[PDB]
Design a binder for this molecule. Structure first.
Ligand SMILES: [Cl-]
Ligand SMILES: [Cl-]
Ligand SMILES: [Zn+2]
Ligand SMILES: [Zn+2]
Lengths: 139, 139
């Protein structure tokens, strides 16, 4: 339910862009990846296959709506999606806009750094646009 | 449709465990990660959101079946799920069984190694057990 020592039970995880009963979407303020968002399950569950099929589905619909919003607002070269949870075993999806000359490309963002990069952190305008784009698709 | 220079248009990608029209499930032979499976879309498509919602849904069903089968056969500490495609932009999902004693834990498998880990490659019984577990769920 709620583990008092799990950061995703105890913290928002970033600026909340959208939420419902099942989950929340946040902009993670990552200096190397503006527009990096996470879909975080509200309750503490370890694996996607711990969820009932209907919950799995609802969660994945939010993830794909967030992919679409990030594509539209950020216009990235590639989208990466991942649910890892090795350090924090509480279901959460990274939705990451990648660019050919970003810090790590074509490595994953968890891999070796490839180049210097200096992407402009999101402005209120972009953050707003992300919120609108997610809302359009989910509300 | 078919990109002649794309590894996932021109190779099985591993030993095939299950397939239908839309996709195939393979066991990736990775000496550090027995039970690493991949769900590869059969045609060339760059992003998940480039798929029709009926196709996204079905692919994700296959992914979640493979997750459940890997958990049953491998009894991992954690599952990692990921669609990256930075090096090969053809939709495919990594379904990775992780263990506390694996090479990278709690890093992602793309990160720095933390320990020695020389695991036993899967026997015919385990690979066959994966095929059966996947098939029972999808057929
Ligand atoms: Cl993670
Ligand atoms: Cl990849
Ligand atoms: Zn938690
Ligand atoms: Zn291809």
């Amino acid at each position: 339910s709620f583990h008092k020592n799990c950061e995703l039970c105890t913290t928002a995880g970033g600026e909340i862009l959208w939420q419902d009963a099942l989950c929340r979407v946040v902009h993670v303020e990552n200096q190397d990846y503006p527009g990096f968002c996470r879909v975080i399950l509200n309750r503490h569950v370890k694996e996607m296959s711990d969820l009932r099929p209907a919950e799995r589905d609802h969660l994945m619909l939010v993830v794909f709506a967030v992919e679409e919003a990030v594509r539209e607002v950020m216009r990235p070269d590639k989208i990466n999606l991942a649910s890892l949870g090795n350090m924090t075993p509480h279901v959460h999806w990274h939705v990451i806009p990648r660019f050919k000359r970003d810090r790590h490309f074509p490595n994953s963002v968890w891999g070796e750094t490839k180049r210097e990069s200096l992407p402009q952190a999101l402005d209120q305008g972009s953050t707003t646009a992300l919120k609108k784009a997610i809302s359009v698709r989910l509300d």
